[PDB]
């Protein structure tokens, strides 16, 4: 063994209560650990970036049912 | 008897078997107990009976011990739970099992194991619950198991466990 | 099962586009076909077939569409999204769309 692979510094890049420019990246994820609410659009590797400038808010009933909206 | 100790008061090195709540729909109550004097009663009553307490204020309150929270590191009690008795078949209590006499497998066979040392049942009588359950094991042969289904249940008691569950069972030696 | 309707109604993510959606119920030919702004829990333009008659269901459906088109144009609406139900765009409902946008 003695093998390993680079860190992928994934996360909630922008936490609810953070104003965001358009195109800011807010969550990094392997998949849909977050499912993108209103105003946000999710990319190829399933990072989801805000489309509209404003505050970031978490809709989060959880269990795969967590969504990131942006409010203007 | 017990005194009030609401919130988190300190205890005496006389254990005062604290951390005791009695509850139903009505009211929650305070902790403080009288240490060994608790144990001296509990072993006699041992979940299958009730006894009144008299904190200052409420001169009487019947409860039947729901559960105990003993220390792990030094086998001693700590917290005890209680449930009030609303009477009129409301009681869901775990009766101890007991076994009578020589069995036919205790004659020439070997072991006589109680697979369920205690078993839960509802009691039609609230203030009258069996203190034990002597079982007539005399007539079983070696390799037979008395199932719960034929366990005597005095005075209209229901059985809160599977009819087909084994309770006692004679076992071969070795 | 009828995973046609939850699928087609999750595909109206473009209610985020601002257009209203136009539900249809090719059931008993009741084809009531409401128009809804989802943001409020509000519907804005009913067209139930209570006594419209008009004959066979495929043409009574187009009658329901042509009547609702007026019923919604009164209030000032023009953006449209045809949230089909489980049903296909097979004709008896397709007439509803043809007659509806014939006279928006």
């Amino acid at each position: 063994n003695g093998r390993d692979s680079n860190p992928k510094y994934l996360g909630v890049k922008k936490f609810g209560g953070e104003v965001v420019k358009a195109g800011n990246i807010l969550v990094r994820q392997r998949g849909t650990k977050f499912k993108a609410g209103q105003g946000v659009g999710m990319g190829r590797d399933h990072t989801l970036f805000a489309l509209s400038d404003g505050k970031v808010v978490f809709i989060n009933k959880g269990k795969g049912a967590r969504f990131i909206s942006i409010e203007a | 008897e017990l005194t009030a100790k609401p919130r988190t008061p300190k205890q005496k090195l006389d254990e005062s078997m604290i951390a005791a709540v009695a509850y139903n729909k009505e009211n929650n109550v305070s902790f403080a107990l009288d240490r060994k004097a608790f144990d001296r009663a509990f072993r006699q009553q041992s979940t299958t009976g009730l006894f009144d307490i008299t904190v200052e204020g409420g001169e009487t309150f019947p409860a039947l011990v729901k559960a105990v929270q003993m220390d792990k590191r030094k086998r001693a009690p700590i917290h005890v739970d209680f449930y009030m008795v609303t009477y009129g078949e409301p009681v869901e209590v775990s009766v101890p099992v007991h076994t009578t006499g020589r069995s036919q497998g205790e004659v020439q066979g070997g072991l006589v194991d109680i697979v369920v040392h205690n078993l839960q049942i509802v009691a039609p009588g609230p203030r009258r619950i069996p203190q034990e359950l002597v079982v007539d094991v005399t007539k079983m042969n070696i390799g037979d198991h008395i199932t719960a289904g034929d366990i005597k249940l005095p005075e209209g008691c229901t059985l809160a466990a599977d009819p087909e569950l084994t309770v006692v069972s004679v076992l071969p030696p070795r | 099962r009828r995973k046609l309707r939850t699928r087609r109604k999750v595909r109206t993510t473009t209610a985020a586009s601002g257009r209203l959606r136009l539900s249809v119920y090719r059931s008993s030919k009741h084809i009531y076909a409401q128009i809804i702004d989802d943001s409020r829990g509000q519907t804005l333009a009913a067209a139930s077939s209570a006594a419209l008659k008009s004959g066979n269901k495929t043409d009574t459906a187009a009658a329901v569409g042509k009547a609702l088109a007026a019923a919604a144009a009164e209030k000032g609406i023009k953006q449209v999204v045809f949230d089909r139900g489980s049903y296909k765009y097979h004709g008896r409902v397709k007439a509803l769309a043809d007659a509806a946008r014939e006279g928006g």
Binding site: - | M70, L111, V112, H117 | -
Partner: protein, 134 residues
């Protein structure tokens, strides 16, 4: 005691026991006083001796079990390369966790059984009789 198939290696730590602080099954029993690993072989010696005291008996549950491999490095080698391969299995035994639990044998007989069964053990222990059990 040996575990029939696994994943290969482990690690270690301790804090007080959360599984098996109360006795069931048996009549009397025995409890740890000290946190520790216990090898398969320490179990098997307790079984051998308490089966010596329990001829034609059959009242010997073993409510513990070597789950954890532990792997010494080979002969004389400087450090470098893996944890060799496993040398023996051990069971974590935190205090208050029962190990042993007899039935069917009179108090002084079980008491002597537990004397010998503890003396082969690497820990303090205590015999207990069951009554404060829900």
């Amino acid at each position: 005691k040996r575990t029939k198939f696994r994943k290969q290696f482990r690690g270690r730590m301790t804090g007080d026991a959360k599984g098996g602080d109360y006795v069931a099954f048996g009549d009397y029993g025995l409890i740890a006083m000290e946190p520790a690993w216990i090898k398969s072989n320490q179990i098997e010696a307790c079984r051998i001796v308490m089966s010596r005291h329990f001829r034609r008996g059959g009242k010997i549950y073993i409510r513990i079990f070597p789950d954890k491999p532990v792997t010494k490095k080979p002969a004389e080698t400087r450090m470098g390369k893996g944890k060799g391969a496993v040398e023996y299995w051990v069971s974590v035994v935190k205090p208050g966790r029962v190990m042993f639990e007899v039935a069917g044998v009179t108090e002084e007989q079980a008491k002597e059984a537990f004397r010998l069964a503890g003396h082969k053990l690497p820990i303090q222990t205590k015999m207990v009789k069951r009554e404060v059990y829900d």
